[model samples]
Target: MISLIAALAVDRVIGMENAMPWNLPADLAWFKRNTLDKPVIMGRHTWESIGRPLPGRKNIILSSQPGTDDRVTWVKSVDEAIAACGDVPEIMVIGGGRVYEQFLPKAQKLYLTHIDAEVEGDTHFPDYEPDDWESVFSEFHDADAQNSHSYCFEILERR
Candidate 1:
């Protein structure tokens, strides 16, 4: 299955710059636990933001540019990323705006960390109504219990 994993806001804001605006350790841990050892597909910008491949996972960076790094399975398009993950049980589309937009139509599962507060950001998630997706799993976390922000971990399946 093609899965999209992201942390976004009510305003659809994802990042102010290339970095996340809010920090949620629990959510980060959830991401790491779920995506670790899986193939992670992302855009070149998203890959660059991290500066290097994340250990324990296969990094597939998408770009139109002609190049490949030792850490990245470089592809020219989203389809290529999907193809690269052939026979794998699932693949994670980890990204910025452009990459998410390109794969939204193809994603069957979405793991979203939803923060209640809104923030100013340049990169945002694609806007889709609640009716567009079915909530399969939902869990809320409090600021006092967590390290950084109060948030909800939600899993949605495409309708």
Candidate 2:
């Protein structure tokens, strides 16, 4: 299964200046918990922005300028990333806008955190129809000290 995972602002803003615009520690912890042991795919820009391979998962990067790292596998195209997954059951596609756009059509699952407010951003999540997916799980959290905005974690599956 291919899963697209991200935290998006109300306006679908996903990134600004190669990094997230908001800081939510709670969401970061949630990411680590869920992605452990799974293979996560991203584009080169996303990989560079994130700086290092995520420790607990197989970090797969789809890029022409493959990064030189021992902890991650770099592939030049979307097809190569898919081929590299081998027998892995589920591969999560984490993004930097364009990467998500490429994988959106092929993903069967979406693990999204909805931020309550929209902020100006350079890279936003691609437009998609909500009608195509069904929400299977959801949990809400109010804004707190560590989390600046009210948010909801939703797990959606293609119907």
Candidate 3:
């Protein structure tokens, strides 16, 4: 399955200063739980933000530059990245803005965490047609001490 996963605000603000603009442990945990043991595809910026390959999963970075990192696979193009996944049918597209925009159209499903508030942002998720998707799963959560803002987790499949 080609799945794009991310946490974005109501304004579609995904990043500020090249990093996440909000703090939500629940989102983080959910990301880890779902992406673990899957082939994760990401852009160079996302790889920089993460700083290391996620353990127990194959980390695939899309970069035009050459690399010798044995821990992660570096592919120059989106097709190459998908090819890098080999026989693994499950592929996770984790991203920076550019990467998200590139893979959004090809994504078969989206695992999204939508934060309730709008905040400062320089990066954003690409616009998608709502009518083209159907909600497969959804759950709402209220703000608490661990989470500062109300949020919703949704799994949407391309229709």
Candidate 4:
């Protein structure tokens, strides 16, 4: 199975100036919990934005450049990354706009945190038709002292 995961604002904004616009600790924690122990595929910019190889998951970078370290498997395309995953049941497609767009068609599920506010951004999530998916799960969270934005964790399965 292939799953695409991301956090988007009301305007479908996902990033600004190469980084996420919001600092939602709870959302980050939720991402970590779901992606841990799975193979994660991301584009070069996404890998750069993250700054390091995520500790427990196999980091697969979709890039044309050769990998400098053994920690990450650098592939030229999404198909190559999927092939590198071998028998892993689910490979998580982490984003940087283009990467998400490339895998969106083939994604079996979408794990998204829908943030309540819209902010200025250079990168936006690719548009998808609502009728093509079914919401399988969702949980709402209101802004609190620690979390700066109100959001909802939602899981959507392609129908």
RMSD (Å) per prediction: 1.8, 1.4, 1.5, 1.3
Candidate 4 at 88: error in angstroms?
1.5
Write candidate 3's Cα lDDT for 111-150 as tens digits. Answer: 9998998887677788877789999899999989989899
Off by over 4 Å in 4: none
- Please list the C-alpha lDDT of all candidates, in the order they appear: 0.83, 0.85, 0.86, 0.89
Tens-digit per-residue lDDT, 72-157, candidate 2: 89898899999888788888898868889999999899999999877877777888787999899999999998888998999999
Q: Candidate 1 lDDT, tens digit per residue, 6-51?
A: 9888777886345766667788799999899899998877877778
Instruction: Record all residue pairs in model 1 with backbone atoms less than 3 Å apart, i.e. clashing.
Output: none
Q: Which residue pairs collide, candidate 2? A: none
TM-score of each: 0.90, 0.93, 0.92, 0.94
- For model 1, the stretches where C-alpha displacement exceeds 4 angstroms are none
lDDT of 2 at 44: 76
Give the alpha carbon lDDT tens digit for every residue of 1-159 in model 4: 999999999888987436655678999999999999999998887888898999999999998888866789999987789999989889999987898999999988999999998787777899988689999999999999988899999999999
Between candidates 2 and 4, the lDDT winner? 4
Q: How accurate is candidate 3 locally (lDDT)?
A: 0.86
Candidates 3 and 4, the one with greater TM-score: 4
